[PDB]
Design a protein around this ligand. Structure first.
Ligand SMILES: *[C@@H]1O[C@H](CO)[C@@H](O[C@@H]2O[C@H](CO)[C@@H](O)[C@H](O)[C@H]2NC(C)=O)[C@H](O)[C@H]1NC(C)=O
Ligand SMILES: *[C@@H]1O[C@H](CO)[C@@H](O[C@@H]2O[C@H](CO)[C@@H](O)[C@H](O)[C@H]2NC(C)=O)[C@H](O)[C@H]1NC(C)=O
Ligand SMILES: COc1ccc2c3c1O[C@H]1C[C@@H](O)C=C[C@@]31CCN(C)C2
Ligand SMILES: COc1ccc2c3c1O[C@H]1C[C@@H](O)C=C[C@@]31CCN(C)C2
Ligand SMILES: *[C@@H]1O[C@H](CO)[C@@H](O)[C@H](O)[C@H]1NC(C)=O
Ligand SMILES: *[C@@H]1O[C@H](CO)[C@@H](O)[C@H](O)[C@H]1NC(C)=O
Ligand SMILES: *[C@@H]1O[C@H](CO)[C@@H](O)[C@H](O)[C@H]1NC(C)=O
Ligand SMILES: *[C@@H]1O[C@H](CO)[C@@H](O)[C@H](O)[C@H]1NC(C)=O
Lengths: 528, 528
């Protein structure tokens, strides 16, 4: 039977699912690790013990314990990101969509979900792998990993809560794919890991980490890169945040063991309820528990690894969306709201920049402000709203990614860069947010091919070429079929726009602003 | 007789001069101070003792001792600025052009020549007052003052070389105009002082200095203002430069008196020959001996005076030219030369910015560089040449003037701002220099009305309206006759272009760059 697969871990039984009036097989909720519960909370993951019998893999698994978004109760725009399954610490599962009839040795794609390292689920409707698996004939895998404190509480030096275990969860799922995807007809020597935002920063982290490199072939990073200012912290900051967490729960703080034992006695929601209280600054785009530069998963600082070429050398395809910062200003900067045009006053502009560059002294805040202010028209509310949007996006997503791509390309084997700027005709968010962080995912997963979601025909056509670009690149290391998406080179620095109009090639994506964020501002904060 | 005038200092006899086929009277070379020679070198000026008999004022006087420009032997472009009379320390004279028949009580204009405080002459062909005096019916006065070390060597605390004596020379001539211009038919209650570059910074200095305020009614400043970074130094830097001068002449340096006596024994050319050796940095747009913030002529720092309104409150008309920095890059930055297009390499760009902002640390040089570099096209030689031109102009002339005008307007009684951007059809300098520092003077003095200088008809028409704007403003405090040159207000900040096309009004002249030079960069250099 087509729905039965025997793996090294045991037999698994899937289900047949309809797709664009055809069908494919899906093996949902396959365990790849022991449940990280009880005494295992905060611990490195453990491989799933093989099982006898047949594992029912016909339905989605639980989602990991996480902070649930309540800013807009019932609004689809935000609920589309919330867990759509029961939450549980027992959540280390993966899902596989397999073309029918079962391939023999085809291209494999593994998706790593985003969510600021504090949230996320592999079961979201926007991550439904059937459309892509079906249309491009690829074996599509979505893994899961512990988020928030469960995945990233870091007490460096302790073996009970070393930090980075959520990255180790991802690595375990990648190991499982490597060892078993052949039984589902996937070629383990041709697996592309792709992810968006924290998922994309994760993909870059596996590119850097010696212990992850051998487990995949190529990578795609969407609106995220390993060096993002919000994607990692030092072991000292990690420790300070773990201790502050314990301090919020009235924990004994005398030794690592006393703190960890207390945190392990608390119910999941107890940690989630005080998680946000540990940030060091009033800020936007900063999350409590994230990866730590520990000298293990990351042997040295991310910058020294990037500079010395200490990373997996292969082909990469990555890019950003036009209005990366809007999602974040809506949620936390004064003057912005879901139902107004959010024209921003000069005062709110300034408290907006302060929130965006939390770690900056005054000279630094002035530098940012001057750089983004049109002084011939300083009281223009649209200009102040769009300027903050750019500040947030350039600093947190775009410039860090442009710095990664320029460092990577020096040693890599091929880079393809895109700028996604199509505003979906059916976007439920206000127009002022533009082409929002996370909204290229739906085109990557092919949602525009299902008529009921009522997208336009050109949006469907757009989705199909992005899907074919991603799959052709996973299969060959080149998105083009033998108009061309040119290779990004350290000399030419070319990239393409991704939208419904005829492909247009450009160069040096946001260089002016990125020289300010990658070279000037850091020098300024280091001197003063 | 029309050419005979009896003043409080004695009888003076002028000469009749032809102008645009008519005639006016000129009284050239009238002494207003005792010759500042011998033991008076470096000393405050002394009033000219009255003389009996008649003073022959039919020919131009000597020019003060100065560094003579030899960069382009015989090239009219540079020779037009050089002394065209014998140089001598006996040079404190003034010239008057008087309408014929002699007016009874008409508008008076006194011109203060520029020359970086180290050079200049009232007798240059571009300063010929006959055209203006004749066309607008004004009594036009050009004064003179000691430049270089003779006018500005400063050993604060000493009464023998206190500094600022060149400013005191100007003040003495203004005092003489005040006391005697009525005899030439000028109205001493309606005198406008106007000057260009160091002359314009001087005009601003008389506006600030308590001891000069009462001697004039209104002011016009051309491409210069008192707070220019090159127009004044501290008493300590002044002293250090005077001592270094003495050190270049093998002077005894044990006490002020020993140093001053030695400097007074040297022939004029001996001081001029080593004058440039005392600058503290390798720089462009910096001159050795300039005014000193001494607590006397300038009671407190220029900025605190500007901020507190400690200055003469009246109407002012001022402005700048489009390409203020080119003259200076030609003379001293690598990559620039008179006979090539001077496309500048990225390396020369950078040594150009270093030369332009001499007092800046590295962080500061990087700030300037980032601010003026188009990173999508960093190797564009035209862009690098024009960028340096702007840097030099914005930092040394334009932004300082915009800072003065905004501080002044808060307390003044009326401001008119212009941006002069007409490139003369007969300019002998290369095209790459654009609308050069000093080249609006010829239009202010009406040279385009004499056909032999072969200007175009629209350039003549341009000269006539600038001449009438300047004179109507000197006469009334408003350049407009009752299309309008609007008043510059702290709210609207309006200004006009001055060229051969229909008047166009704009606002916030170079605000973007001037916020960088007047607010950001100073804060940066103060922090780091
Ligand atoms: C990716 O790597 C391969 C080699 O591992 C590159 O192909 C080689 O290109 C050189 C030219 O410098 C040839 O001499 C070799 O014979 C090629 N090897 C093979 C097996 O093709 C390829 O150019 C690299 N791509 C990029 C963009 O760097
Ligand atoms: C220049 O100063 C004069 C006053 O010295 C200003 O004219 C006065 O304007 C006020 C209005 O606020 C009237 O009440 C006075 O009666 C006016 N005085 C005279 C004698 O006219 C004039 O507005 C000032 N100009 C500018 C641009 O500030
Ligand atoms: C690092 O960026 C993120 C930080 C927080 C959140 C999201 C982020 O990226 C967005 C897209 C997707 O990756 C998942 C969740 C996001 C959208 C929903 N919000 C409420 C939570
Ligand atoms: C502060 O600016 C100056 C510094 C030096 C010089 C000049 C300056 O302004 C120019 C215009 C006019 O004022 C007089 C001389 C200038 C032109 C001739 N050069 C050689 C000397
Ligand atoms: C698999 O699990 C689902 C969900 O509880 C159940 O409804 C379905 O019938 C199961 N199939 C088998 C054979 O266990
Ligand atoms: C499709 O469009 C209809 C028509 O208004 C709307 O009611 C429906 O909610 C849309 N469906 C989706 C998935 O948005
Ligand atoms: C004035 O001086 C000039 C220059 O030397 C001389 O030629 C002229 O005749 C003089 N006039 C008188 C009356 O002294
Ligand atoms: C006027 O134009 C002529 C014609 O070429 C030229 O020879 C002369 O030098 C010009 N005069 C001036 C003042 O430049």
């Amino acid at each position: 039977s087509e729905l039965l697969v025997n793996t090294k871990s045991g037999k698994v039984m899937g289900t047949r699912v309809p797709v664009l009036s055809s069908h494919i097989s899906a093996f949902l909720g396959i365990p790849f690790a022991e449940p990280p519960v009880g005494n295992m909370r905060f611990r490195r993951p453990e491989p799933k013990k093989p099982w006898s019998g047949v594992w029912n893999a016909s339905t989605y698994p639980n989602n990991c314990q996480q902070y649930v978004d309540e800013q807009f109760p019932g609004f689809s725009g935000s609920e589309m990101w919330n867990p759509n399954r029961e939450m549980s610490e027992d959540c280390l599962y993966l899902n596989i969509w397999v073309p029918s009839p079962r391939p023999k040795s085809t291209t494999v794609m593994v998706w790593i979900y985003g969510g600021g390292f504090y949230s996320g689920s592999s079961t979201l409707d926007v991550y439904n792998g059937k459309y892509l698996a079906y249309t491009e004939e690829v074996v599509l895998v979505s893994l899961s990993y512990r988020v928030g404190a469960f995945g990233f509480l870091a007490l460096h030096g302790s073996q009970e809560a070393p930090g980075n275990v959520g990255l180790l969860d991802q690595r375990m799922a990648l190991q499982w794919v490597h060892d078993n995807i052949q039984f589902f007809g996937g070629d383990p020597k041709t697996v592309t890991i792709f992810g968006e935002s924290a998922g994309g920063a994760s993909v870059g982290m596996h590119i850097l980490s010696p212990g992850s490199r051998d487990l995949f072939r190529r990578a795609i990073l969407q609106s995220g890169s390993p060096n993002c200012p919000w994607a990692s912290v030092s072991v000292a900051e990690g420790r300070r945040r773990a201790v502050e967490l314990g301090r919020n729960l009235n924990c004994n703080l005398n030794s690592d063991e006393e703190l960890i034992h207390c945190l392990r006695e608390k119910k999941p929601q107890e940690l989630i309820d005080v998680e946000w209280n540990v940030l060091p600054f009033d800020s936007i785009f900063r999350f409590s528990f994230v990866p730590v530069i520990d000298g293990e998963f990351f042997p040295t600082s991310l910058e020294s690894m990037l500079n010395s070429g200490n990373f997996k050398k292969t082909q990469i395809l990555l890019g950003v969306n036009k209005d990366e910062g809007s999602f974040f200003l809506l949620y936390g900067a004064p003057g912005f709201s879901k139902d107004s045009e959010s024209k921003i006053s000069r005062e709110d502009f300034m408290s907006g920049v302060k929130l965006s560059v939390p770690h900056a002294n005054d000279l630094g805040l002035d530098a940012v402000t001057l750089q983004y202010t049109d002084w011939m028209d300083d009281n223009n509310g649209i200009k102040n709203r769009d300027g903050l949007d750019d500040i947030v996006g350039d600093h947190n997503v775009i410039c860090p990614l442009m710095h990664f791509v320029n460092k990577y390309t020096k040693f890599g084997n091929g880079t393809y860069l895109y700028f996604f700027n199509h505003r979906a005709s059916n976007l439920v968010w206000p127009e002022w947010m533009g082409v929002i962080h996370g909204y290229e995912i739906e085109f990557v997963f092919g949602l525009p091919l299902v008529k009921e979601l009522n997208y336009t025909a050109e949006e469907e056509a757009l989705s199909r070429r992005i899907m074919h670009y991603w799959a052709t690149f996973a299969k060959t290391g080149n998105p083009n079929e033998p108009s061309k998406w040119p290779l990004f080179t350290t000399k030419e620095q070319k990239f393409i726009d991704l939208n419904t109009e005829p492909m247009k090639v450009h160069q040096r994506l946001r260089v002016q602003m990125c020289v300010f964020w990658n070279q000037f501002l850091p020098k300024l904060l280091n001197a003063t």
